Amino acid sequence: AGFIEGGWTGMVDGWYGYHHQNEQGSGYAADLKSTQNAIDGITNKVNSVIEKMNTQFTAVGKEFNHLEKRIENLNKKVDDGFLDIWTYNAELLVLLENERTLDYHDSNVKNLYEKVRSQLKNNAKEIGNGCFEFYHKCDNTCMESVKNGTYDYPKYSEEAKLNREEID
Amino acid sequence: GDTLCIGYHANNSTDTVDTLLEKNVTVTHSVNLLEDKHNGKLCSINGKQPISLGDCSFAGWILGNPMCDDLIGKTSWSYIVEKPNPTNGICYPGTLEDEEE
């Protein structure tokens, strides 16, 4: 849903998460592991990008007399050139790093989706909007096992094949 | 049948940032790095006594221009304020060599 479809305003405990819907109802739940890694990385990124800019001690301006006009224009050029250089660096890195930040978030979405997919290959059928419909019943315990990386595929493989082969 | 879905977060934030591929990208969370509020507050820095020469040029203050006696005894500062157009400078016409040094 990075651009596939929309986000979730009801999920307010993390960047990324799941929306589960079973017999016991529905609800949002953030994935703390991937959200935590993303916070770690974006924090280190912002701090590195900002803190990398340290400059030497400078009393900037200079005024040169009527016999030092060449001396003068050179100093104004140096001042304004350091201006241009630091401005150029800040602008480019802000643009590039906002790009890379959005793309990093997209890749985190993709990785979470692929994890949930690899856990449930034939026990669930993919719904095209980043969803899965179970051929079996995934109770709260099953949902949590999917969420903390410990889904049991042989546990439900029997019921899922039965319901799958009948559905199809 | 049951469904288990995956998605990311949304809020009511309208913070827009620019990327090279796309401008005015509304993000959920951002940080402004640019302070752009010269506040009416213009004061000293470390509670010092920043001294204004008033209508005296730097040369007029250093040489001792007679109309610049409001500056005598002004001993310490965090910086010095000079108008672009003071009235009392080098009164007898002349120059202070290396004025700028």
Binding site: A1, G2, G6, G7, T9, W15, I42, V46, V49, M53, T55, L83, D84, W86, T87, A90, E91, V94, E97, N98, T101, L102, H105, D106 | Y8, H9, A10, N11, N12, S13, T14, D15, V17, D18, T19, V25, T26, V27, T28, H29, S30, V31, N32, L33, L34, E35, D36
Partner: peptide
């Protein structure tokens, strides 16, 4: 802080906001 010529330097910490 550093003087620059930019008029806006807010950096994205989060991902795009897409309601609904």
């Amino acid at each position: 802080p550093k003087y620059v010529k930019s008029t806006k330097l807010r950096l994205a910490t989060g991902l795009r906001n897409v309601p609904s």
